Amino acid sequence: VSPYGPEARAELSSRLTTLRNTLAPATNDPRYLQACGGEKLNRFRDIQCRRQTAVRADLNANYIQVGNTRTIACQYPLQSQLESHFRMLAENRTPVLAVLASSSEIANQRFGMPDYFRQSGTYGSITVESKMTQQVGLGDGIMADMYTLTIREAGQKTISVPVVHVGNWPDQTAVSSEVTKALASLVDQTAETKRNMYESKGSDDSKLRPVIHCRAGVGRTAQLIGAMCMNDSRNSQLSVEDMVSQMRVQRNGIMVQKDEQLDVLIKLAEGQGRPLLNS
Ligand SMILES: O=[N+]([O-])c1ccc(O)c(OS(=O)(=O)O)c1
Numbered sequence: 001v002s003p004y005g006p007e008a009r010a011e012l013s014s015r016l017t018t019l020r021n022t023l024a025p026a027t028n029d030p031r032y033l034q035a036c037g038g039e040k041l042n043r044f045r046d047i048q049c050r051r052q053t054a055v056r057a058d059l060n061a062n063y064i065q066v067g068n069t070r071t072i073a074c075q076y077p078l079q080s081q082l083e084s085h086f087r088m089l090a091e092n093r094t095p096v097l098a099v100l101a102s103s104s105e106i107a108n109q110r111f112g113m114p115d116y117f118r119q120s121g122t123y124g125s126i127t128v129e130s131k132m133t134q135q136v137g138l139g140d141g142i143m144a145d146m147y148t149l150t151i152r153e154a155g156q157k158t159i160s161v162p163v164v165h166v167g168n169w170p171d172q173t174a175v176s177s178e179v180t181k182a183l184a185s186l187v188d189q190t191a192e193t194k195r196n197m198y199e200s201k202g203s204d205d206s207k208l209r210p211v212i213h214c215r216a217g218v219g220r221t222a223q224l225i226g227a228m229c230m231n232d233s234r235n236s237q238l239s240v241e242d243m244v245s246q247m248r249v250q251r252n253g254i255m256v257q258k259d260e261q262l263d264v265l266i267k268l269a270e271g272q273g274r275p276l277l278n279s
Contacts, residue, residue: 009266072210
């Protein structure tokens, strides 16, 4: 009876599970971006990049549109992908880069997660200057550390990108619906202030997209993108089924990895009177 009761939830999981299963990548899957002769592309072998929406041939990153909300979801860039990663950021005039990987993950060198935004560096012909800005508490002890990345390259227009780094959102978990809302708000506001700057100077659908990544770019990243989607007034009536199905067909079947992460999107939906299932 209740649109958010056990039966609705079970039906939703059922549909999404079949989707994840059928979206699993086969070897040399035509639906997924393939690596360039030996060079490692995917941080995680089974977490691939939908070819049709791929942003760059050498990155595991996808253009994503949930309803009307446009973003870019990617994996934490590998050491070898940094220059291409920075080029994507600059070419997109990235209004905000949201990093949900924890300080502990990036610090552990066994994870091969380069500390590319908290310190300056040079990658290929690109030089990056990192500058610390404000710190915003999101609730429940979760903290957002802000930065600005100035990307310089000979002959290219210099681009500065605001960074929102949630440094203590544990891998494989879901922060509360309340924290998720505070985060979505901060990310959206950060992006809007930047977009406004570009617009005030005289400004493309493929550009000015918020860029979000965690470790694999399918768990924490998906929870945030879903929350950002629900904060967009243009998505009235977009169901939870639609949101998740769209993220999955546009990146991979793992988008919204944990049941606890789906549960946050469901709770947020319930709070808005947003439907869970289609039909
Ligand atoms: O689904 N996975 O295979 C996967 C692997 C490593 C992660 O750290 C992770 O969690 S994620 O970074 O929030 O996406 C998810």
